[PDB]
């Protein structure tokens, strides 16, 4: 069971809330867009359809009542211009920031668009809620932060210098963050995603996370690519442990705020497993080239993840495998 | 004698030059010595806050032919395409454009980070793409924060206490990036409260010793902003001058290096009123008040590094540093 979570959203379910949702048509965000539209509340999304889709909006109306849907009032806007932010947080209480384009490689190939989404338009939104006074901000956060830091698990307090552009504005959002809870006295809360995977996260485009890209190229029967040597580590963490932590965190107790916390699982699997997995949970649903290292790419990744258990009483339920037979299907009947 | 040195043999083969935030304080005095060298410079500004009067004042202290090999494009920093064009055929560049006072940042972060962040990340990817052989920028003592080390040195540092001194923190993580996945290895030079002649005077954000120096003459207030005994590493503009051109023309081990640019002397608040006070009646001529939120507490740079690497001499102090900018103030002001 998650009895804190389970007791937020009985609570959320009797006094509903406003949220706003930037990134909304995004992975991420369409998924937040489901659980806080099964929960009764009004939301108000924003997207600009970069690397988000109207189908995935159009999966989450499919997936809610059509009373609930009319809770949702969507707007197509960009993040880099500040009035469209501020006209977005009226009436807000919550707000969960996912907008942003993420990709290490995108961000070394064109650090400036990344650096106007990331930085620019991180701070636009968070201006336009802490003038707007809302009652929560959480935000998207990284564990590229986390840099060539060794040590293994990582815990929260220790990072090291930033391996690529990405990792910077990532960085970036919190140091703003930080500084404004300082001249403010705005809270907020920065997640620390560790690789989320899950239903909608997009398996097309030059930049598709690994799950995704992996799933597509298995069940084409194409080439499957591992990036260096394969002993490559990561804390996959399906979607709903993110789901969980935003919420957690959009209606955490004040001296739990201003923080930054680790949201995965614990884990660590090799991009050697990884394959592996992929390949037995594609079976049971009836239907490898080693190249150079990735540029700018971070070697080891494991989340300590006991800061989130203590101070917000996160409960991780779903480990790697369990995810990964709970999205295959998703996969299989997107791609057919 | 490193400095002059170098002076010299960029006097017998003139380099070209691109200053950002050349009609500023910093920039125009960086100006007025290039051009005093014969260097071909390209100056680009947007008169934020920044004056044509200062490029003025620069063109009467040189020769006309001097101010000939001076190229002026108005324009931003903000827009890529800009900054892009700036670059054309520039072998040293000394980024010195951005919106600085605290203060300013706090009411408005939103403008301080377009101009401190992406005007700055702008200049530096140009620069990069132009392969230019240096790039030098303006970084801040602020970037300490509330680290309470004493004296402050370069490694150690705390957590930025405003918007300002994040958007100062960030260009010295994009450009060690820059190095780490461009190979392009830059300079920061973390500026310790800069004084001396074109500091503006005027406006609500106008630094310390200019706005004292103003109040002081028009019989004013003079305001302290909490104990008195907050404390300072004045640095006359004669020495970042030095900086600027000694980090132009390193040799490839000491770029990709943050240097302190400062004296090493810490002065308090009260001291300081006291200094400014003797200097103008020696040319025949207070209220506390609340901290200003933001601050950072005590500054005093150790300088051991810039002369270690940079063969760095800091010469002038803050009194003969006061003796030779009160005689600019009193001409402007009047
Ligand atoms: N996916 C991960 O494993 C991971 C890990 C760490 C951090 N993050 C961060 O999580 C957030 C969401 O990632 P995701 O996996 O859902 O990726 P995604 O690309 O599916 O979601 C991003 C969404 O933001 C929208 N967006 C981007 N720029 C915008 C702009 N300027 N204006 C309006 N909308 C804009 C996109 O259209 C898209 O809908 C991002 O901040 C990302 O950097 C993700
Ligand atoms: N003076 C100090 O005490 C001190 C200390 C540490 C760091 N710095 C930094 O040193 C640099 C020089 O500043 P200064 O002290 O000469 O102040 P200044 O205000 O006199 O100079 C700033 C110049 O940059 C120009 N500018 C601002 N935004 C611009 C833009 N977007 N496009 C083009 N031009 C723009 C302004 O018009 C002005 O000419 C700045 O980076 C400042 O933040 C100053
Ligand atoms: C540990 C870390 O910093 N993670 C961050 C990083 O994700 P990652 O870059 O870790 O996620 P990814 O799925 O893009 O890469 C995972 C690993 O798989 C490798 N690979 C990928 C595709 C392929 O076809 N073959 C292959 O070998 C890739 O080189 C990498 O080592 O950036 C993301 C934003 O996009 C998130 O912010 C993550 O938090
Ligand atoms: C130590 C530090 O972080 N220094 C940086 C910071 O300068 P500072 O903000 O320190 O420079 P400043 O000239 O604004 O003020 C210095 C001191 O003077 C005080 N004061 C000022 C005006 C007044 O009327 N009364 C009064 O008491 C002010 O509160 C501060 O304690 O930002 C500058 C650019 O903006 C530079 O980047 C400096 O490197």
Not at 110 to 125: S, V, Y
Request: aromatic share 12%; with cysteine; net charge neutral.
């Amino acid at each position: 069971y998650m009895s804190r979570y389970e007791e937020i959203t009985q609570q959320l379910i009797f006094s509903p809330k406003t949220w706003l949702i930037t990134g909304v048509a995004g992975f991420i965000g369409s998924n937040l867009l489901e659980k806080l539209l099964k929960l009764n509340q009004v939301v108000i999304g924003l997207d600009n359809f970069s690397t988000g889709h109207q189908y995935n909006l159009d999966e989450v109306k499919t997936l809610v009542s059509t009373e609930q849907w009319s809770r949702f009032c969507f707007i197509e806007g960009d993040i880099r211009d500040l009035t469209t932010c501020e006209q977005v947080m009226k009436g807000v209480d919550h707000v969960l920031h996912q907008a942003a384009l993420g990709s290490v490689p995108r961000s070394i190939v064109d650090p400036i668009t990344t650096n106007a989404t990331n930085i620019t338009g991180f701070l636009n939104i968070l201006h336009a809620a802490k003038n707007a006074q809302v009652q929560s901000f959480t935000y998207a956060a990284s564990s590229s932060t986390y840099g060539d830091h060794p040590a293994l698990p990582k815990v929260e307090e220790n990072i090291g210098n930033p391996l690529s552009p990405y990792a910077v504005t990532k960085y970036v959002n919190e140091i703003y963050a930080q500084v404004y809870a300082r001249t403010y006295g705005f809270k907020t809360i920065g997640l620390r995603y560790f690789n989320v995977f899950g239903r909608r996260q997009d398996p097309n485009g030059a930049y598709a996370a690994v799950i995704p890209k992996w799933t597509a190229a298995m069940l084409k029967g194409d080439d499957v690519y591992i990036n260096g040597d394969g002993e490559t580590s990561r804390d996959f963490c399906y979607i709903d442990n993110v789901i969980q932590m935003n919420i957690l965190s959009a209606l955490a107790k004040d001296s739990a705020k201003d923080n930054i916390y680790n949201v995965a699982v614990g884990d660590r699997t090799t991009l050697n497993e990884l394959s592996g997995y992929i390949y037995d949970e594609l079976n049971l649903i009836h239907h490898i080239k080693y190249r150079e290292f990735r540029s700018g790419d971070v070697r080891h990744s494991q989340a300590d993840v006991t800061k989130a258990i203590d101070l917000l009483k996160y409960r991780p339920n779903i480990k790697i495998r369990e995810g990964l037979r709970l999205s295959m299907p998703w996969y299989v009947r997107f791609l057919k």
